[PDB]
Amino acid sequence: KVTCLVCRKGDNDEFLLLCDGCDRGCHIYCHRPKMEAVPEGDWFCTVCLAQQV
Ligand SMILES: [K+]
Ligand SMILES: [Zn+2]
Ligand SMILES: [Zn+2]
């Protein structure tokens, strides 16, 4: 179900970041700036960042 925002594939799911604000995702290797690992705690996608104040 989860696909990457940048490349639109849902493969290599161990490399797939999952947004804590919605159901969107992103391969760590697709992200810019460089992300060498899935972080702990919370990651927010760009659509969620746009809802912050
Ligand atoms: K939300
Ligand atoms: Zn990707
Ligand atoms: Zn999100």
PDB file of N, CA and C and ligand atoms in Angstrom:
ATOM      1  N   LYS A   1       0.832  -1.226   0.000  1.00  0.00           N
ATOM      2  CA  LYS A   1       0.000   0.000   0.000  1.00  0.00           C
ATOM      3  C   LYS A   1       0.868   1.279   0.000  1.00  0.00           C
ATOM      4  N   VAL A   2       1.942   1.335   0.798  1.00  0.00           N
ATOM      5  CA  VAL A   2       2.772   2.562   0.860  1.00  0.00           C
ATOM      6  C   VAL A   2       3.702   2.642  -0.343  1.00  0.00           C
ATOM      7  N   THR A   3       3.691   3.785  -1.025  1.00  0.00           N
ATOM      8  CA  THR A   3       4.667   4.036  -2.094  1.00  0.00           C
ATOM      9  C   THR A   3       5.472   5.305  -1.801  1.00  0.00           C
ATOM     10  N   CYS A   4       6.593   5.410  -2.489  1.00  0.00           N
ATOM     11  CA  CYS A   4       7.495   6.539  -2.349  1.00  0.00           C
ATOM     12  C   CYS A   4       7.001   7.750  -3.136  1.00  0.00           C
ATOM     13  N   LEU A   5       6.952   8.896  -2.462  1.00  0.00           N
ATOM     14  CA  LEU A   5       6.570  10.164  -3.070  1.00  0.00           C
ATOM     15  C   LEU A   5       7.412  10.586  -4.289  1.00  0.00           C
ATOM     16  N   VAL A   6       8.712  10.296  -4.266  1.00  0.00           N
ATOM     17  CA  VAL A   6       9.644  10.711  -5.295  1.00  0.00           C
ATOM     18  C   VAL A   6       9.591   9.790  -6.510  1.00  0.00           C
ATOM     19  N   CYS A   7       9.761   8.484  -6.306  1.00  0.00           N
ATOM     20  CA  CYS A   7       9.855   7.524  -7.428  1.00  0.00           C
ATOM     21  C   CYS A   7       8.589   6.685  -7.696  1.00  0.00           C
ATOM     22  N   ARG A   8       7.618   6.759  -6.790  1.00  0.00           N
ATOM     23  CA  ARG A   8       6.335   6.031  -6.892  1.00  0.00           C
ATOM     24  C   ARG A   8       6.375   4.496  -6.825  1.00  0.00           C
ATOM     25  N   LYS A   9       7.500   3.908  -6.455  1.00  0.00           N
ATOM     26  CA  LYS A   9       7.558   2.462  -6.244  1.00  0.00           C
ATOM     27  C   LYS A   9       7.405   2.197  -4.749  1.00  0.00           C
ATOM     28  N   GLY A  10       6.927   1.002  -4.427  1.00  0.00           N
ATOM     29  CA  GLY A  10       6.754   0.552  -3.046  1.00  0.00           C
ATOM     30  C   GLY A  10       7.689  -0.600  -2.698  1.00  0.00           C
ATOM     31  N   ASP A  11       8.746  -0.800  -3.504  1.00  0.00           N
ATOM     32  CA  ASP A  11       9.733  -1.859  -3.278  1.00  0.00           C
ATOM     33  C   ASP A  11      10.816  -1.421  -2.273  1.00  0.00           C
ATOM     34  N   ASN A  12      11.653  -2.383  -1.881  1.00  0.00           N
ATOM     35  CA  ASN A  12      12.733  -2.201  -0.906  1.00  0.00           C
ATOM     36  C   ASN A  12      12.134  -1.544   0.314  1.00  0.00           C
ATOM     37  N   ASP A  13      11.102  -2.178   0.856  1.00  0.00           N
ATOM     38  CA  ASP A  13      10.321  -1.518   1.893  1.00  0.00           C
ATOM     39  C   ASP A  13      11.085  -1.292   3.202  1.00  0.00           C
ATOM     40  N   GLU A  14      12.193  -2.000   3.406  1.00  0.00           N
ATOM     41  CA  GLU A  14      13.058  -1.739   4.542  1.00  0.00           C
ATOM     42  C   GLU A  14      13.724  -0.375   4.453  1.00  0.00           C
ATOM     43  N   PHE A  15      13.812   0.188   3.246  1.00  0.00           N
ATOM     44  CA  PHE A  15      14.356   1.545   3.030  1.00  0.00           C
ATOM     45  C   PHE A  15      13.288   2.636   2.960  1.00  0.00           C
ATOM     46  N   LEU A  16      12.046   2.281   3.248  1.00  0.00           N
ATOM     47  CA  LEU A  16      10.925   3.171   3.018  1.00  0.00           C
ATOM     48  C   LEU A  16      10.587   3.907   4.305  1.00  0.00           C
ATOM     49  N   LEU A  17      10.746   5.234   4.312  1.00  0.00           N
ATOM     50  CA  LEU A  17      10.235   6.079   5.401  1.00  0.00           C
ATOM     51  C   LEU A  17       8.723   6.120   5.313  1.00  0.00           C
ATOM     52  N   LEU A  18       8.077   6.093   6.476  1.00  0.00           N
ATOM     53  CA  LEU A  18       6.630   6.199   6.552  1.00  0.00           C
ATOM     54  C   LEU A  18       6.310   7.434   7.395  1.00  0.00           C
ATOM     55  N   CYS A  19       5.456   8.320   6.860  1.00  0.00           N
ATOM     56  CA  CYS A  19       5.158   9.606   7.485  1.00  0.00           C
ATOM     57  C   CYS A  19       4.363   9.334   8.725  1.00  0.00           C
ATOM     58  N   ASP A  20       4.691  10.043   9.798  1.00  0.00           N
ATOM     59  CA  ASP A  20       3.901   9.954  11.033  1.00  0.00           C
ATOM     60  C   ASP A  20       2.639  10.857  11.078  1.00  0.00           C
ATOM     61  N   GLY A  21       2.462  11.709  10.080  1.00  0.00           N
ATOM     62  CA  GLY A  21       1.285  12.524   9.995  1.00  0.00           C
ATOM     63  C   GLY A  21       0.235  12.029   9.003  1.00  0.00           C
ATOM     64  N   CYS A  22       0.596  11.117   8.089  1.00  0.00           N
ATOM     65  CA  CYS A  22      -0.339  10.630   7.062  1.00  0.00           C
ATOM     66  C   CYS A  22       0.166   9.278   6.607  1.00  0.00           C
ATOM     67  N   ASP A  23      -0.389   8.718   5.532  1.00  0.00           N
ATOM     68  CA  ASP A  23       0.069   7.428   5.002  1.00  0.00           C
ATOM     69  C   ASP A  23       1.081   7.530   3.826  1.00  0.00           C
ATOM     70  N   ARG A  24       1.773   8.663   3.701  1.00  0.00           N
ATOM     71  CA  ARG A  24       2.689   8.852   2.578  1.00  0.00           C
ATOM     72  C   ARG A  24       4.045   8.249   2.946  1.00  0.00           C
ATOM     73  N   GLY A  25       4.888   8.024   1.939  1.00  0.00           N
ATOM     74  CA  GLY A  25       6.212   7.386   2.189  1.00  0.00           C
ATOM     75  C   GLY A  25       7.323   7.926   1.334  1.00  0.00           C
ATOM     76  N   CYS A  26       8.578   7.560   1.616  1.00  0.00           N
ATOM     77  CA  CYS A  26       9.694   7.996   0.756  1.00  0.00           C
ATOM     78  C   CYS A  26      10.882   7.091   1.007  1.00  0.00           C
ATOM     79  N   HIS A  27      11.503   6.560  -0.057  1.00  0.00           N
ATOM     80  CA  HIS A  27      12.722   5.797   0.100  1.00  0.00           C
ATOM     81  C   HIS A  27      13.750   6.731   0.688  1.00  0.00           C
ATOM     82  N   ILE A  28      14.517   6.261   1.647  1.00  0.00           N
ATOM     83  CA  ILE A  28      15.634   7.067   2.144  1.00  0.00           C
ATOM     84  C   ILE A  28      16.588   7.447   1.047  1.00  0.00           C
ATOM     85  N   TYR A  29      16.766   6.570   0.066  1.00  0.00           N
ATOM     86  CA  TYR A  29      17.673   6.852  -1.043  1.00  0.00           C
ATOM     87  C   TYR A  29      17.129   7.812  -2.079  1.00  0.00           C
ATOM     88  N   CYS A  30      15.818   8.037  -2.048  1.00  0.00           N
ATOM     89  CA  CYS A  30      15.161   9.054  -2.894  1.00  0.00           C
ATOM     90  C   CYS A  30      15.137  10.447  -2.296  1.00  0.00           C
ATOM     91  N   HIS A  31      15.257  10.522  -0.990  1.00  0.00           N
ATOM     92  CA  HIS A  31      15.238  11.777  -0.269  1.00  0.00           C
ATOM     93  C   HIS A  31      16.444  12.646  -0.573  1.00  0.00           C
ATOM     94  N   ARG A  32      16.216  13.967  -0.627  1.00  0.00           N
ATOM     95  CA  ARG A  32      17.320  14.979  -0.739  1.00  0.00           C
ATOM     96  C   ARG A  32      16.927  16.081   0.218  1.00  0.00           C
ATOM     97  N   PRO A  33      17.777  16.473   1.154  1.00  0.00           N
ATOM     98  CA  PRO A  33      19.159  16.005   1.398  1.00  0.00           C
ATOM     99  C   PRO A  33      19.354  14.526   1.774  1.00  0.00           C
ATOM    100  N   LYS A  34      20.603  14.111   1.814  1.00  0.00           N
ATOM    101  CA  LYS A  34      20.970  12.694   1.988  1.00  0.00           C
ATOM    102  C   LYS A  34      20.429  12.178   3.304  1.00  0.00           C
ATOM    103  N   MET A  35      19.792  11.016   3.261  1.00  0.00           N
ATOM    104  CA  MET A  35      19.331  10.323   4.444  1.00  0.00           C
ATOM    105  C   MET A  35      19.889   8.902   4.374  1.00  0.00           C
ATOM    106  N   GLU A  36      20.811   8.583   5.266  1.00  0.00           N
ATOM    107  CA  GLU A  36      21.488   7.301   5.187  1.00  0.00           C
ATOM    108  C   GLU A  36      20.787   6.220   6.026  1.00  0.00           C
ATOM    109  N   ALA A  37      19.761   6.557   6.792  1.00  0.00           N
ATOM    110  CA  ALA A  37      19.022   5.555   7.547  1.00  0.00           C
ATOM    111  C   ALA A  37      17.616   6.045   7.880  1.00  0.00           C
ATOM    112  N   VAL A  38      16.688   5.108   8.139  1.00  0.00           N
ATOM    113  CA  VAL A  38      15.337   5.463   8.583  1.00  0.00           C
ATOM    114  C   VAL A  38      15.496   6.006  10.005  1.00  0.00           C
ATOM    115  N   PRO A  39      15.143   7.254  10.263  1.00  0.00           N
ATOM    116  CA  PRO A  39      15.386   7.754  11.629  1.00  0.00           C
ATOM    117  C   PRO A  39      14.425   7.155  12.634  1.00  0.00           C
ATOM    118  N   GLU A  40      14.776   7.263  13.899  1.00  0.00           N
ATOM    119  CA  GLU A  40      13.847   6.930  14.958  1.00  0.00           C
ATOM    120  C   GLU A  40      13.050   8.132  15.349  1.00  0.00           C
ATOM    121  N   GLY A  41      12.032   7.893  16.150  1.00  0.00           N
ATOM    122  CA  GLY A  41      11.039   8.920  16.411  1.00  0.00           C
ATOM    123  C   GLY A  41      10.289   9.274  15.132  1.00  0.00           C
ATOM    124  N   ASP A  42       9.964  10.550  15.002  1.00  0.00           N
ATOM    125  CA  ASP A  42       9.022  10.979  13.995  1.00  0.00           C
ATOM    126  C   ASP A  42       9.639  11.588  12.744  1.00  0.00           C
ATOM    127  N   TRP A  43       9.137  11.158  11.584  1.00  0.00           N
ATOM    128  CA  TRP A  43       9.431  11.802  10.293  1.00  0.00           C
ATOM    129  C   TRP A  43       8.104  12.275   9.645  1.00  0.00           C
ATOM    130  N   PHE A  44       8.126  13.522   9.162  1.00  0.00           N
ATOM    131  CA  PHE A  44       7.018  14.117   8.431  1.00  0.00           C
ATOM    132  C   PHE A  44       7.362  14.414   6.986  1.00  0.00           C
ATOM    133  N   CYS A  45       6.431  14.037   6.129  1.00  0.00           N
ATOM    134  CA  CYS A  45       6.488  14.322   4.706  1.00  0.00           C
ATOM    135  C   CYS A  45       6.225  15.793   4.452  1.00  0.00           C
ATOM    136  N   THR A  46       6.408  16.203   3.212  1.00  0.00           N
ATOM    137  CA  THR A  46       6.260  17.589   2.819  1.00  0.00           C
ATOM    138  C   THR A  46       4.823  18.117   2.869  1.00  0.00           C
ATOM    139  N   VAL A  47       3.876  17.229   2.678  1.00  0.00           N
ATOM    140  CA  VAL A  47       2.475  17.594   2.750  1.00  0.00           C
ATOM    141  C   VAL A  47       2.116  17.902   4.221  1.00  0.00           C
ATOM    142  N   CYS A  48       2.555  17.043   5.137  1.00  0.00           N
ATOM    143  CA  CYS A  48       2.462  17.326   6.575  1.00  0.00           C
ATOM    144  C   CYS A  48       3.237  18.533   7.061  1.00  0.00           C
ATOM    145  N   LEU A  49       4.462  18.738   6.576  1.00  0.00           N
ATOM    146  CA  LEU A  49       5.199  19.962   6.921  1.00  0.00           C
ATOM    147  C   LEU A  49       4.407  21.233   6.532  1.00  0.00           C
ATOM    148  N   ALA A  50       3.678  21.160   5.423  1.00  0.00           N
ATOM    149  CA  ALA A  50       2.879  22.303   4.939  1.00  0.00           C
ATOM    150  C   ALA A  50       1.671  22.627   5.833  1.00  0.00           C
ATOM    151  N   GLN A  51       1.296  21.704   6.724  1.00  0.00           N
ATOM    152  CA  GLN A  51       0.181  21.911   7.681  1.00  0.00           C
ATOM    153  C   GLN A  51       0.617  22.466   9.037  1.00  0.00           C
ATOM    154  N   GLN A  52       1.926  22.476   9.287  1.00  0.00           N
ATOM    155  CA  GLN A  52       2.474  23.029  10.528  1.00  0.00           C
ATOM    156  C   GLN A  52       2.240  24.529  10.661  1.00  0.00           C
ATOM    157  N   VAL A  53       2.191  25.012  11.901  1.00  0.00           N
ATOM    158  CA  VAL A  53       2.358  26.441  12.183  1.00  0.00           C
ATOM    159  C   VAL A  53       3.358  26.594  13.298  1.00  0.00           C
TER     160      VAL A  53
HETATM  161  K     K B   1      -1.938  15.051  10.235  1.00  0.00           K
HETATM  162 ZN    ZN B   2      11.723   6.115  -4.100  1.00  0.00          ZN
HETATM  163 ZN    ZN B   3       2.601  13.178   5.819  1.00  0.00          ZN
END
